[PDB]
Amino acid sequence: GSSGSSGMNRTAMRASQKDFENSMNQVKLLKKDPGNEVKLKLYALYKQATEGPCNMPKPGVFDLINKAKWDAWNALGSLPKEAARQNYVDLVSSLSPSLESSSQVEPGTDSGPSSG
């Protein structure tokens, strides 16, 4: 059986587009080299929160570059975008110790169904 170790908590916490746009950025502002291992895990979600489940044709062995990603984005499987984004950020945050989760949004004003 699989389970947490310290304590998997959520508290109705979700990652919005804003959080992502920031996370993906931090992954570029870093001057450290974690390894192609993570560089892929970050791309797997991106394509998952933008395109969805790996629906592309499997690349050829010779194409190590592609094959590397395919296995990254493929792993996800039927992972929904809503979750994909949460996974992407959840990672970038793991690398960086300090992070001000500024989750803000405006209610805006919808329009009513009216025609001339």
UniProtKB/Swiss-Prot annotation:
This is Enoyl-CoA delta isomerase 2. In the C-terminal section; belongs to the enoyl-CoA hydratase/isomerase family. The gene is ECI2. It comes from the Eukaryota. Disulfide bonds: none annotated. Abundant in heart, skeletal muscle and liver. Expressed in CD34(+) T-cells and CD34(+) bone marrow cells. Residues 16-101 form the ACB domain. The modification Phosphoserine is found at S78, S96. The modification N6-acetyllysine is found at K28, K39, K69. An acyl-CoA binds at Y43, A44, L45, Y46, K47, K69, Y88. The modification N6-succinyllysine is found at K28, K32, K39, K47, K58, K67, K69. Able to isomerize both 3-cis and 3-trans double bonds into the 2-trans form in a range of enoyl-CoA species. Has a preference for 3-trans substrates.
